[PDB]
Every structure is written in structure tokens, then in C-alpha cells.
Amino acid sequence: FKCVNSLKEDHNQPLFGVQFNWHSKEGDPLVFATVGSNRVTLYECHSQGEIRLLQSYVDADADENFYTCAWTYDSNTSHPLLAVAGSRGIIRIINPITMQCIKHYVGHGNAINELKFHPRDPNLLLSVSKDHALRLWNIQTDTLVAIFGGVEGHRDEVLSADYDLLGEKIMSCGMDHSLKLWRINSKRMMNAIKESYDYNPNKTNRPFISQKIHFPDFSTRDIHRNYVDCVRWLGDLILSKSCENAIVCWKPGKMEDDIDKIKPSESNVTILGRFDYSQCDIWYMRFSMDFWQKMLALGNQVGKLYVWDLEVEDPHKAKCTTLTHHKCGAAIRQTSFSRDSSILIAVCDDASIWRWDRL
């Protein structure tokens, strides 16, 4: 990769999130969103490294701090949608064409640290919160499907979560040092999702009942020894990080144990590898993968990017390269690959945005 451009947003506050729109249409330029301060901004990538500024949504509350965003599309029209959330605990669904807010969701109103859309269902939105819970929403019927919590759930802020390939299960992580698995292909959760689609408050008297899921299907505190701030599935394996200068590749159970036969009492984990790096020992730094899961990127606290090629026979064989620029010195909170991995964008604590193009 080579650095082709950079810019700084006028608010001078940390950029906490960046996401390419992997649903952008054939023959349209590549578009990414950034979140920081109380705003979300869209940019288009053009030739000669140009990053073209489009339009922002600015929250009416000056004390809102957006922490996360996620792209989906309208399941009836195919038009793109953007979900954003942060410190106020309000999920906003934004029309990215006009940047109008279309609607919003409040849970209990505590900070939301990450949003993720289900990989097969564009209406199913997962939020993770400072209140120790995850929430699954159906943004077609405007229903809260389920809350994942209880004393056997997380015991401090939830910082990240990820759906597996088919969206049959979720792995979550946070400040309690634990990683927890939640199956959403149980008969109970499949029924709840079905009921959420059948719910129309204009045609019934009942409120929609949300499931309370109080028991994860697996839990470990044996991977990391500090806050776990990012997690992603790699097939049936997990990649996760803390602030110990490492991304760990691991799985529940013993080497030969099938993920779908793991019982909630499983006490073992298997470590398949670990990707070390330097100067990323502050809390709240995310890694990202490309659409095909061929590539992994992480930025560190002094502006260096690490990129791993995962197109190798076993996880521990991943090939690392590093990307530095003499003017890029601030902490990189998140990266995003374009769908094809031709562009990598990094965003920073000084409101700076860095574009790297594949050679």
C-alpha cells in the first residue's frame, strides 16, 4: 500500500469509527463514513488520491459523542442506510443520501460502543452497551428482539461483538476481560425473530415482548488479561485483542472440538496463533478485516498501521507488513478496507483521515 492522501476534520476531536459502504452500487465511487465529535461524515474516493467531502449529519445535542457506525440497506427499496450511536445511548438511522435522520431507538439510554448488522438479514442490528448488555433490534418493525445480559452475562461495559458467517451466533467482549458466545439460531431466538417480523403495533394490542437471554453458550476469561476491545470471527475461529500488543487467534474447546457441540460449561480454549505488534497498549483500538476476510489491519497509538495477509494455510502463518508516514503520528482508533481491499482508510485521535491505495 502507498499513502495517497490525508485530511483533518474541523472539529479536532477523536475519530472513533470508519466504515466503507460495502453495499455501494456498481459504477458508483467507493464511499466511507467517519464518526467523531457529534457528527457523521461521508466521503467518496476518487482518482489521484482524491477524498471528496459530501455531507455530514450533526446531532442537535452538542454533548453527543458518536462512537460507532454501521451500513445496511432498506430491505424494500435497496437504498443504503447508516446507523450511528454513542454516548447518549441513542441509535440513529440516517439516510446517507440526504443525511436526514429517519428514526431512532433508545434502549435504557446508556452509551453504545459498537453497532453491527446481521450478515444475512439487513434489518437485524446488534448494539453493545456500557450497561453490560447487548441488544438485538429489528429495524423493519422497530422492535427490540432480545437483550443479552443477566448475572451470567457481562459484568462491565461491553466493547465489541461480531456475528459469525451465517449470523447463527454472536461473540461479545468487554471490560470484564471475558469473551462470551450467544447462539441466535436456538428455537427460542428464531421464534423471537419471526415474531418481531409479524409485529405491527397498529394491528394489535400487545406490546412486543423482548427475550431476556441471561446465559451465554460459552464464556472465557483465559485469552487476555485486560479489557477486550475488539472481536471478530474468522470462520469457526475467533480473533480478539486487548491492550497487550497482541491479536489472539483462538477457539472454544480443544483442538478437535466442533463449535456447534461446545456446551456452556466448556472450560477449555485452544490458541491457534498470536499476532504481535508494538505501541498499541492504550484501551479502545479496533482491528478490521476486508469483505472476503483475506486481510486484517490494526493501527497503533503512534500512527503506524499493521496489515496481515490471512490467505495462508493456518492462522499462525499470517504475513505482516507495516505502513508508516512521517506526518501520521496520532493514535489510529479504526481502519476500514474497501470491499475489494484496493483502499484502506485509517482514522485518528487528532481528527485526521489517511488513505492508503494498494500497489
Q: Which residues bind ligand 6PU (CB under 6 A)?
A: 14, 16, 67, 113, 157, 159-160, 229-230, 284-286, 333, 349
Which CB atom, from 16 or from 337, has the smaller least distance to ligand 6PU? Answer: 16
Residue 2's CB is within 10 A of a number of other CB atoms, namely 11
Which CB atom, from 7 or from 190, has the smaller least distance to ligand 6PU? Answer: 7
Which CB atom, from 116 or from 286, has the smaller least distance to ligand 6PU? Answer: 286
CB 225 within 8 A of CB 213: no
State the nearest-atom distance from the C-beta of 275 to ligand 6PU, in Å.
17
State the nearest-atom distance from the C-beta of 226 to ligand 6PU, in Å.
13
Which CB atom, from 154 or from 333, has the smaller least distance to ligand 6PU? Answer: 333
State the nearest-atom distance from the C-beta of 67 to ligand 6PU, in Å.
4
State the nearest-atom distance from the C-beta of 292 to ligand 6PU, in Å.
23
State the nearest-atom distance from the C-beta of 299 to ligand 6PU, in Å.
11
Residue nearest to ligand 6PU (CB): 113
Residue 3's CB is within 10 A of a number of other CB atoms, namely 19
Whole-angstrom Cα distance, residue 275 to residue 255?
A: 19
Helix (H) or strand (E) holding 49: none
Which CB atom, from 199 or from 227, has the smaller least distance to ligand 6PU? Answer: 227
Concatenated DSSP letters of 93-120: EE-TTT--EEEEEESSS--EEEEEE-SS
State the nearest-atom distance from the C-beta of 199 to ligand 6PU, in Å.
31
SS3 321: strand
Which CB atom, from 160 or from 335, has the smaller least distance to ligand 6PU? Answer: 160
Concatenated DSSP letters of 229-293: -EEEEETTEEEEE-SSSEEEEEEESSTT--GGG--TT---EEEEEEEE-SS--SS---EEE-TTS
SS3 172: strand
Which CB atom, from 123 or from 242, has the smaller least distance to ligand 6PU? Answer: 242
State the nearest-atom distance from the C-beta of 330 to ligand 6PU, in Å.
8
CB 239 within 8 A of CB 287: yes
CB 94 within 8 A of CB 84: yes
- Cell digits of residue 185: 439460531
